[PDB]
């Protein structure tokens, strides 16, 4: 189903278990650093994204902090 954004899976698993959050509370489209995600946690998560080889800024990610939007920016600024 999704290609680069497959990756985005292991995101998903790993903020869920990091925040102690459950796959019904911690939904996608919820705002991380309203759900207890730091920025240092943030920027830490680009220091993963870059390392896959993901050409992201931090404001990006900054501005929202969501795994929604982060699914989307994933694939579509990657060539797929």
């Given at each position: ?34 759900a207890g ?44």
């Open positions: 189903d999704n290609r680069h954004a497959a990756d985005y899976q292991q995101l998903r698993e790993r903020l869920i278990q990091e925040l102690n959050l459950t796959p019904q509370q911690l939904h996608e489209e919820s705002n991380l650093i309203q995600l730091d920025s240092i946690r943030l920027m830490r998560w680009l220091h993963w994204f870059r390392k896959n080889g993901y050409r992201l800024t931090l404001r990006e990610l900054y501005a929202a902090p969501t795994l929604a939007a982060w699914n989307q920016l994933m694939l579509s600024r990657s060539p797929e």
